[PDB]
Design a protein around this motif. Sequence first.
Motif, PDB file in Angstrom:
ATOM      1  N   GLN A   1       0.791  -1.294   0.017  1.00  0.00           N
ATOM      2  CA  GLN A   1       0.066  -0.042   0.021  1.00  0.00           C
ATOM      3  C   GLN A   1       0.888   1.291  -0.121  1.00  0.00           C
ATOM      4  OE1 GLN A   1      -2.024  -1.419   3.254  1.00  0.00           O
ATOM      5  NE2 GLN A   1      -3.876  -2.391   2.039  1.00  0.00           N
ATOM      6  N   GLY A   2       1.609   1.360  -0.949  1.00  0.00           N
ATOM      7  CA  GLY A   2       2.395   2.661  -1.044  1.00  0.00           C
ATOM      8  C   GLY A   2       3.522   2.513  -0.078  1.00  0.00           C
ATOM      9  N   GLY A   3       4.261   1.369   0.652  1.00  0.00           N
ATOM     10  CA  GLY A   3       4.827   1.270   1.628  1.00  0.00           C
ATOM     11  C   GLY A   3       4.480   1.960   2.944  1.00  0.00           C
ATOM     12  N   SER A   4       2.859   2.007   3.108  1.00  0.00           N
ATOM     13  CA  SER A   4       2.215   2.454   4.644  1.00  0.00           C
ATOM     14  C   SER A   4       2.006   1.371   5.552  1.00  0.00           C
ATOM     15  CB  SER A   4       0.995   3.192   4.076  1.00  0.00           C
ATOM     16  OG  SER A   4       0.066   2.204   3.552  1.00  0.00           O
TER      17      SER A   4
ATOM     18  N   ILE B   1       7.277   2.730   5.650  1.00  0.00           N
ATOM     19  CA  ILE B   1       8.583   2.262   5.095  1.00  0.00           C
ATOM     20  C   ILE B   1       9.819   3.288   5.476  1.00  0.00           C
ATOM     21  CG2 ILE B   1       8.206   2.789   2.719  1.00  0.00           C
ATOM     22  CD1 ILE B   1       9.514  -0.651   2.528  1.00  0.00           C
ATOM     23  N   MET B   2       9.149   4.629   5.161  1.00  0.00           N
ATOM     24  CA  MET B   2       9.998   5.794   5.621  1.00  0.00           C
ATOM     25  C   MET B   2      10.669   5.729   6.958  1.00  0.00           C
ATOM     26  SD  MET B   2      10.436   8.897   3.745  1.00  0.00           S
ATOM     27  CE  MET B   2       8.779   8.807   2.623  1.00  0.00           C
ATOM     28  N   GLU B   3       9.736   5.488   7.822  1.00  0.00           N
ATOM     29  CA  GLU B   3      10.208   5.637   9.142  1.00  0.00           C
ATOM     30  C   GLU B   3      11.264   4.343   9.628  1.00  0.00           C
ATOM     31  OE1 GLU B   3       7.424   5.964  12.569  1.00  0.00           O
ATOM     32  OE2 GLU B   3       6.213   7.389  11.637  1.00  0.00           O
TER      33      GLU B   3
ATOM     34  N   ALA C   1      14.011   5.956  12.489  1.00  0.00           N
ATOM     35  CA  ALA C   1      13.032   6.255  13.634  1.00  0.00           C
ATOM     36  C   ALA C   1      12.492   5.037  14.079  1.00  0.00           C
ATOM     37  CB  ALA C   1      11.796   7.088  12.873  1.00  0.00           C
ATOM     38  N   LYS C   2      12.417   3.940  13.419  1.00  0.00           N
ATOM     39  CA  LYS C   2      11.988   2.706  14.011  1.00  0.00           C
ATOM     40  C   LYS C   2      12.944   1.722  13.618  1.00  0.00           C
ATOM     41  CE  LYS C   2       7.018   2.826  14.558  1.00  0.00           C
ATOM     42  NZ  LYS C   2       7.199   1.936  16.066  1.00  0.00           N
ATOM     43  N   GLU C   3      13.302   0.955  14.574  1.00  0.00           N
ATOM     44  CA  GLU C   3      14.286  -0.343  14.289  1.00  0.00           C
ATOM     45  C   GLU C   3      13.847  -1.360  13.228  1.00  0.00           C
ATOM     46  OE1 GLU C   3      15.348   1.275  16.876  1.00  0.00           O
ATOM     47  OE2 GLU C   3      13.390   0.803  18.003  1.00  0.00           O
ATOM     48  N   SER C   4      14.367  -1.882  12.618  1.00  0.00           N
ATOM     49  CA  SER C   4      14.209  -2.431  11.177  1.00  0.00           C
ATOM     50  C   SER C   4      14.411  -4.051  10.928  1.00  0.00           C
ATOM     51  CB  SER C   4      14.993  -1.644  10.171  1.00  0.00           C
ATOM     52  OG  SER C   4      16.148  -1.680  10.212  1.00  0.00           O
TER      53      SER C   4
END
Length: 143
Positions: free
Chosen positions: A55-58, A78-80, A85-88
């Motif tokens: 969904q557009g990386g949401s 995905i930006m975060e 901002a968030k651990e991945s």
Amino acid sequence: LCFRMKDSALKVLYLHNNQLLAGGLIKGEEISVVPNRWPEALEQGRGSPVILGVQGGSQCLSCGVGQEPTLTLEPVNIMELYLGAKESKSFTFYRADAGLTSSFESAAYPGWFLCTVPEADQPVRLTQELGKSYNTDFYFQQC
């Protein structure tokens, strides 16, 4: 730029009830495949570390943070994840390219791979078993 995915049995990956399913035999969910910004801190011989979004990386696919991995779509952009901002790591997969197909191995749970089952229209899930009933090879098509 997004990708649509199929397993190697040509089942299309698509969303239903906030789950990625494999079936649609549907052009497929447009999946964001984004390289981890900080790969040196990971195991890169296993493949290129990526975050998978829909969904557009949401929302992004996570293996969770439990003792046993489980695949969920989490409402994180995905930006975060890509920002720090968030651990991945629970959201990171190592993408191994075989040429025609790729596999996706959990960075947080080594030895577990993204996969589908033979029955149509079932959830994409994770497995440690290769070469058996679970399909761990995926085709990309560009959008």
